[PDB]
């Protein structure tokens, strides 16, 4: 939940940018639950560290609707899409298609 | 963003005959001790079933046949569910038992 | 002897409800009249028949005696009660009022404008045998209730001590009066009834006195109306003053002879104003969000004239209600009246409820430390400076607020666990981030509770188990606002936008 | 003269709720203390603030004086009220209690342990003018209520006849005492107050006596706490004893002179136990399924410390409630207390309510046939042997059960006639076959009525048309169990599996 390490993470809030996991909790309904998906995403997989594979995703109530939400961690390697970041984003839209949940994409990535 | 999800005229599509949600009969944390520590150590799965379903009520199908696979109906937080939990090996009997069960739930639209 | 079929109450607020209550109890119809800005009013509801006067201003309306008098006459009433203030003291009314066929519940013309000028009065009193002030040390404003009828009789219903006053305006009246002994009572007592026979008095009324340390009292002025704080007096006696008014006016004679007017126990009263404790009593006027009166009980009584959700007008006296408690002792009434002030809560406006609670709980009040300077004296102890107090708070109000919106339940599947706003998370602890705002300071509260405990919330009460010592503080919500009573005060918390 | 803001009640159950009631009425904050197994208890609810002592047993909790005294002290209480039992009588507490700054609502240390040994006691009572026993036929256990303050004053609030008891354990006290004449009253009255000044008593207390047929009374012992059965004594006078305790405690002196304490009418009381009528008083302890106190009324009082659904503890006194009735005569109270006892129903455990029912209606109790052996004497007429009584019953029981389960209404079509569990059939009569089980005797009841009637059921009541003569017997369900009051007894019936 640290992201790209206190290091960059702070250099983030510096830009006046709310952090990923924050934008989420702000977006959800007061006190709603949140079911995260693959947090241990890309754990000890890539050479370096890529927390939750640079993208957090999960299901939470937004305006009384169970919604699928995904936002990238600009702090993690510039938010860029490592192979597993893609597998994640995708696995999220499967859960969304298969279970008919509207989608909220909190976009903030390099390339 | 919240506001968009606001005017989605959204309505849920699933539909089960869920009932009033009643809690288990044994603290869910008791599971920690249900699972043996020795990976190759035999234990009764019903004990984990008892801690997840409502009122720890579980109706068992082909009770005493291919016991290697336990199958049954119950509810979970209201929603009705058909369960299939392993209990050992898995000889022919267990599979037929499990295929016949899936038939029954697939016919009543129970998860 | 004449009879009343409908008594018109030319007045508004808690006082109209006060007299209507009696009117009703007597099988008498109550006709209140209303201003424009009060067609929604409480006393217009409690009235059996009610007329529309002028517009908003108190002048353009409740003061127009020509219409009040006509309304009353076309309304079928046979008498008028002016209540306190407005037109309760001015011959011109009673005159043309009694000159209309109706019976004016009060003194006759003559006696009213009599105490209209300090000169005319100083004269009657001087030549009446009631000590005046020659020409005072820790002066104690003590008054006397009088009652006479259309038959010469005229008893005094003991006294009152209305010293605790905010830059002159009674705040805490009580009866009996603290110090004064048996003799000093019957002393000033007959001395008022003397000033009574003086103007040839009819109704009820009070004789404001001003006694000092050395032990002597002096006439200050007199009110030819039922006084503001008559509750306390009815308290200690057991008589319904206004009922007696409706009687004398008929003809009926007084039921008690001077040496019959009772006096068991003690009573204390407070005035609940839409003023402002620290803000230096600037009579605010918004709208009553929350209004919870303490429940009826021991010897608790509350005379109110508003109801939660009412519009608190600017054109009228900012008094919401009168809270009175009695006992068999003095502290039994004070301790009980402070009970009521704590169970009482008004939110969505500036209240003097805050100040009142601490001035009944100040030690000075325990002891007979009374004068007309007490309110000024312990100045700091009673109007302390604010402070964005603890985080200790912020968390309670955050937990409180979270537990005040069910999330939302869909008819799709009601039993849905997505309605539980417990901030559930996969493996770490319940995380709920709230964008709140109390007073004039917004805080994004971070609610990460691992042990689901801390604070529960049932009904309008926040129950906290602080280390084995469980205590429950009142807290409730209305609209996007949550009122949480935190340390006497009643802070309002709402969401950022 | 000292003042109390928060009185901490060092006890639990009916008595802490009984002391809570008074402190509250007096405008005083009530802090209760609780063991672990009582975080759910009633007295923790009715407490402003409550504190967690020990765990389970009475030892390591309610009797831990070190924590109670630190509790109330950290709670903001300035006084402790012991209650009866627990830590009520033991200078050690009162001692370290009063030496903590706290005012101990009870006699001084001195006077407490004085009555601690029958030696030290018979010493001052012999040298007090208090008749002891020489060294008794049909002796009657008669006690005296007495009250002193911090100012030497001390009068007796008359007496009580606490004779009818289970192997030493009071069950039916009354006030005044049936027999004894006017003088015999003033007799033991002062006799007690003698022994009172004897130990130099502060609070209230009872002096146990034992009068016999020959006409002589003898001191037995004395309790240095408010007695368990004080309500009936409050009944006959009009005094709130507890309130008085908080009075003497502050300084205040007794308000009535000896020839002032009144004695209009008669009061009778009973102790409601989780015991067992015939099972030889085996204080069972399960869980309160059903609990319906008769509604207040005539001269009905009921002091309870439990609420239906609560957990009946094993580690404490199995006394649920105290049922007190009053009349202008002795027969008006008993007949009216008998009423209360039949309107009252507890289900889901072993109760003495059946026992009490027929002991108050026992012709022996009609006449003053009182002594300390009456309990054992008519032992048969009060503890009969059971029996699986008629089908007479079974019938009701089934019809009743049937009529307490709606069947099921499908939201599909609510109006569905398939919900009517009338047991409808083609051309024969309504057939309902039900597998019941009462006491421990299961029976498959055949319910074949062609005449729809027999028994109908409204609310918690079974109405039967027994041949022109309609009679209504109470009956209600809770869970898998259905409680039906069948001839005194309150039998529990449920579904066999």
- The DSSP annotation for D381-403 comes to HHS-------HHHHHHHHHHHHT
Mutation for A interface: B5, B12, B111, most A CBs within 10 A: B5
| Closest Cβ–Cβ partner in D3, D25, D39 for C331 | D3
Task: Assess contact for D225 and D82: CB atoms under 8 A.
Answer: yes
**CA D39, CA D50: separation in Å to the nearest integer?**
9
Chain C residues 304-363 with CB within 8 Å of chain D: 325, 327, 329, 331-332, 334-339
Nearest to C19 by CA among C199, C234, C176: C234
Region of C314 (left: φ > 0; alpha: ψ -120 to 50; beta: rest) is alpha
DSSP-assigned letter for residue D53: -
Nearest-angstrom CA–CA distance, D252 and D259: 19
- Does A63 sit within 8 Å of B5, measured CB to CB? yes
Outline where DSSP puts E strands in D274-332. 290-292, 300-304, 319-327
Query: Residue D326: beta bridge partners?
Result: D267
| Region at C138 (left for phi over 0; alpha for psi -120 to 50; beta for the rest) | left
At a CB cut-off of 8 Å and minimum separation 6, what does C322 contact?
A: C14, C228, C229, C231, C269, C270, C271, C272, C302, C303, C304
Residue C468, min C-alpha distance to chain B (Å): 24
Neighbours of B24 (CB within 10 A): 17
DSSP C310: -
- Within 8 A by CB and 6+ apart from D246, the residues are D4, D7, D22, D23, D26, D28, D79, D81, D105
Computed on alpha carbons and rounded to an integer, the radius of gyration of chain D in Å comes to 26
Q: Which of D162, D180, D305 is nearest to D232 (CA)?
A: D162
Q: Which residues contact D68 (CB under 8 A, 6 or more apart)?
A: D8, D10, D33, D53, D62, D80, D87
Residue D81: φ, ψ to 5°: -125, 110
Q: Residue D364, class by beta-carbon neighbours within 10 Å (0-12 exposed, 13-18 middle, 19+ buried)?
A: middle
Selected from 3.30.70.20, 3.40.50.20, 3.20.20.70, 3.40.50.300, the CATH number assigned to the domain covering D1-132 reads: 3.40.50.20
- Pairing outcome for strands D49-52 and D29-34: parallel
C448: helix, strand or coil:
strand
The stretches of D200-329 forming alpha helices (DSSP H) are 230-236, 241-250
Report the residue of chain C nearest A34, measured CA to CA. Answer: C425
B66: distance to nearest CA of chain A, Å? Answer: 33
Architecture per CATH, domain D386-497, reads as: 2-Layer Sandwich (3.30)
Cβ contacts of C429 within 8 Å, gap of 6 or more: C448, C449, C450
Mutate to test the interface with B, among C410, C411, C416 (most CBs of B within 10 A): C416
Query: Contact at 8 Å (CB) between C222 and C205?
Result: yes
- DSSP strand E in D108-218: where? 140-148, 154-161, 172-175, 204-211
The tokens describing D327, both together, are 């009349």
- Best of D26, D27, D253 to disrupt the C interface (most C CBs within 10 Å) is D27
Report yes or no on chains C and B touching (3+ CB pairs under 8 A): yes
CA distance C379 to D444: 81
Partners of C278 in the beta sheet?
A: none
Answer for the pair D431, D425: CB distance below 8 angstroms, yes or no. yes
* Partner B contacted by C412 (CB < 8 A): yes
Distance, in Å, from the CA atom of D477 to the CA atom of D366, rounded to the nearest integer, reads 35
How many CB atoms are closer than 10 A to CB C374?
Answer: 22
**Residue in the structure block whose two tokens are 């029912």:** D357
CA D184 to chain centre: 29
Q: Which helix (H) or strand (E) holds D15?
A: helix D13-25
Angstrom distance (rounded) from CA D485 to CA C123: 81
**Residue C54 in contact with residue C35, Cβ under 8 Å?**
yes
Characterize the bridge pairing of strands C469-478 and D49-52.
Answer: antiparallel
Place of tokens 């012709």: D363
Cα Rg for chain A, rounded, in angstroms?
A: 14
Distance CA D342, CA D358 (A): 10
Cβ A59 vs Cβ A68: under 8 Å: yes
Put simply, the answer to whether D44 touches C470 (Cβ < 8 Å) is yes
What does each C-alpha distance from D432 to D401, D410, D415, D429, D460 come to in angstroms? 11, 21, 21, 10, 22
Architecture of domain D136-385: 2-Layer Sandwich (3.30)
Which residues, listed in sequence order, are joined to residue B76 by a DSSP beta bridge?
B79
Residue written as token pair 């007190």: D324
C76 with C6: CB under 8 angstroms?
Answer: yes
Count other C-beta atoms under 10 Å from residue C222's C-beta: 29
What is the three-class DSSP state of C253? Answer: coil
Contact B8/A102, CB-based, under 8 Å?
yes
Q: Which residue has the tokens 């280390």?
A: C467
Residues of A in contact with B10 (CB under 8 A): 65, 102
Which fold would CATH assign to domain C373-497?
Glycoprotein, Type 4 Pilin (3.30.700)
Judge residue C52's burial from the number of C-beta atoms within 10 Å of its C-beta, 0-12 exposed, 13-18 middle, 19 or more buried. middle
Closest-CA residue to D33 (of D89, D94, D74, D91) = D74
Homologous superfamily of C137-372 = ATP-grasp fold, B domain (3.30.470.20)
Distances, alpha carbon D270 to alpha carbons C148, D140, D180, in Å? 54, 17, 21
CA C58 – CA D141 distance, rounded (Å) = 74
Longest CA–CA separation in chain B, Å: 55
End-to-end CA distance of chain C: 67
Q: Phi and psi at residue C15, in whole multiples of 5°?
A: -85, -30
Domain ranges across chain D: 1-132, 136-385, 386-497
β-partners of residue C161 are C142
Verify whether the Cβ–Cβ distance B18 to C415 is below 8 Å: yes
Asked whether the beta carbons of residue A65 and residue B8 sit closer than 8 angstroms, the reply is yes
CA distance D241 to D255: 12
Calpha distance D291→D404 (Å, rounded)? 18
- Strand order across the A34-36 sheet: A34-36, A55-62, A65-72, A103-106
Q: Is D247 a catalytic residue?
A: no
Task: Say whether C335 and D74 touch across the interface (CB within 8 A).
Answer: no
Distance CA C34, CA C90 (A): 20
From CA C124, how far away is CA C129, in angstroms rounded? Answer: 9
Active site (catalytic) residues of C: 225
> Residue D43: what are its φ and ψ, rounded to 5°?
-60, -15
Cβ separation C413–B11 shorter than 8 A: no
In this structure, which long-range contacts are made by residues C259-264, counting pairs with CB atoms below 8 Å and at least 24 apart in sequence? C260/C155, C261/C155, C261/C156, C261/C157, C261/C158, C261/C237, C262/C236, C262/C237, C262/C238, C263/C158, C263/C176, C263/C236, C263/C237, C264/C236, C264/C238, C264/C328
Which chain B residues are Cβ-neighbours of A27 within 8 angstroms?
1-2
Sign of the Cα torsion D193, D195, D197, D201 reads negative
Report the length, in residues, of chain B: 111
Q: Which of D225, D301, D334, D350 is catalytic?
A: D225
List residues of chain C with CB under 8 Å from any CB of chain A: 402, 405, 407-408, 410, 417-418, 420-428, 431-435
Contact D315, D57 (CB under 8 A): yes
d(CA C275, CA C185): 34
Q: Which residues contact C28 (CB under 8 A, 6 or more apart)?
A: C4, C5, C6, C7, C246
Distance from CA of B75 to the nearest CA of A (A): 20
- Residue A26 marked ligand-binding: no
Is residue C483 a contact partner of residue C424, using CB atoms and an 8 Å limit?
no
Does chain D reach chain A with at least 3 CB pairs under 8 Å?
no
User: Which of C256, C230, C244, C83 shows the shortest CA–CA distance to C159?
Assistant: C230
Contacts of A65 in chain B (CB under 8 A): 5, 8, 10
Q: Which strand (E) or helix (H) includes residue B48? A: helix B46-49
SS3 D217: coil
Distance between CA atoms of residues A70 and A20, nearest Å: 9
Cα–Cα distance measured from residue D304 to residue D9, given in angstroms and rounded to the nearest whole number: 16
Nearest-angstrom CA–CA distance, C57 and C187: 43
Helix crossing, C65-74 with C91-98: angle to 10°?
Answer: 30
Q: Which residues of C285-295 are buried (b: 16+ CB within 10 A; e: fewer)?
A: eeebbbbebbe
CA pair distance A28, D307, nearest whole angstrom: 41
Q: Which two tokens stand for residue D83?
A: 């209650």
How many degrees, rounded to 5, is the angle at CA A22 between CA A16 and CA A24? 125
């Amino acid at each position: 939940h640290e992201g790209g390490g206190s290091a960059a993470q702070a250099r983030h809030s510096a830009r006046g940018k709310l952090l990923v996991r924050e934008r989420i909790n702000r977006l959800l309904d007061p006190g709603s639950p949140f079911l995260e998906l693959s947090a241990l995403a890309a754990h000890e997989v890539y050479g370096e560290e890529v927390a939750a594979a640079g993208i957090v995703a999960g299901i939470g109530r937004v305006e009384g609707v169970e919604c699928m939400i995904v936002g990238n961690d600009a702090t993690v390697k510039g938010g860029t899409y490592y192979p597993l970041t893609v597998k994640k984003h995708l696995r999220a839209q499967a859960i969304a298609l298969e279970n008919r949940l509207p989608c909220i994409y909190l976009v903030d990535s390099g390339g | 963003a919240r506001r968009c999800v606001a005017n989605l005229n959204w309505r849920k599509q699933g539909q089960l005959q869920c009932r009033a949600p009643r809690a288990p009969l044994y603290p869910a944390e008791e599971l920690y001790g249900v699972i043996p520590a020795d990976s190759k150590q035999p234990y009764d799965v019903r004990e984990v079933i008892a801690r997840l379903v409502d009122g720890s009520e579980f109706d068992e199908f082909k009770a005493l046949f291919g016991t290697t696979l336990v199958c049954g109906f119950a509810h979970l937080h209201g929603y009705p569910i058909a369960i299939l939990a392993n209990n050992g090996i898995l000889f022919a009997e267990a599979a037929q038992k499990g295929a016949h069960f899936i038939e029954l739930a697939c016919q009543r639209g129970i998860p | 002897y004449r009879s009343i079929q409908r008594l018109l109450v030319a007045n508004r607020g808690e006082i109209a409800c006060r007299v209507m209550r009696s009117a009703r109890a007597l099988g008498i119809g109550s006709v209140a009249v209303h201003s424009d800005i009060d067609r929604h009013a409480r006393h217009v509801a409690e009235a059996d028949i009610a007329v529309d006067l002028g517009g908003a201003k108190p002048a353009d309306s409740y003061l127009r005696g020509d219409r009040i008098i006509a309304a009353a006459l076309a309304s079928g009433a046979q008498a008028i009660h002016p209540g306190y203030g407005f037109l309760s003291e001015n011959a011109d009314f009673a005159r043309a009022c009694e000159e209309a066929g109706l019976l004016f519940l009060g003194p006759p013309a003559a006696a009213i404008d009599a105490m209209g000028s300090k000169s005319a009065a100083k004269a009657l009193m001087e030549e009446a045998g009631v000590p005046l002030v020659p020409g005072l040390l820790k002066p104690r404003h003590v008054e006397i209730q009088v009652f006479a009828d259309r038959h010469g009789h005229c008893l005094y219903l003991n006294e009152r001590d209305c010293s605790i006053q905010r830059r002159h305006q009674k705040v805490v009246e009580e009866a009996p009066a603290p110090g004064l002994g048996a003799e000093l009572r019957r002393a000033m007592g007959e001395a008022a009834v003397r000033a009574a026979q003086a103007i040839g008095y009819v109704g009820a009324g009070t004789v404001e006195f001003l006694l000092d340390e050395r032990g002597q009292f002096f006439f200050m002025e007199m009110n030819t109306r039922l006084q503001v704080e008559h509750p306390v007096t009815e308290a200690i006696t057991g008589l319904d003053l206004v009922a007696w008014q409706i009687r004398v006016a008929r003809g009926e004679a007084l039921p008690l002879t001077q040496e019959q007017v009772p006096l068991n126990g003690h009573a204390i009263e407070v005035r609940l104003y839409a003023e402002d404790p620290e803000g230096d009593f600037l009579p605010a006027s918004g709208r009553l969000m929350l209004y919870r009166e303490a429940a009826a009980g021991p010897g608790r009584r509350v005379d109110s004239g508003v109801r939660e959700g009412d519009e608190v007008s600017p054109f009228y006296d900012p008094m919401l209600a009168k809270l009175i408690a009695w006992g068999e002792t003095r502290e039994e009434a004070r301790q009980r009246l402070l009970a009521m002030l704590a169970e009482t809560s008004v939110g969505g406006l500036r209240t003097n409820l805050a100040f009142l609670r601490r001035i009944l709980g100040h030690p000075a009040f325990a002891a007979a430390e009374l004068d007309t300077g007490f309110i000024a004296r312990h100045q700091d102890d009673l109007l302390p400076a604010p402070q964005a107090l603890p985080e200790h708070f912020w968390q309670a109000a955050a937990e409180a607020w979270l537990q005040s919106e069910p999330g939302h339940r869909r008819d799709d599947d009601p039993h849905s666990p997505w309605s539980r706003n417990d901030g559930w998370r996969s493996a770490l602890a319940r995380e709920s981030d709230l964008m709140l705002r109390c007073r004039d300071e917004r805080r994004c509260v971070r609610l990460r509770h691992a042990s689901p405990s801390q604070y529960r919330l049932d009904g309008d009460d926040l129950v906290s188990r602080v280390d084995g010592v469980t205590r429950r503080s009142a807290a409730l919500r209305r609209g996007r606002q949550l009122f949480l009573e935190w340390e006497g005060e009643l802070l309002a918390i709402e969401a950022v936008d």
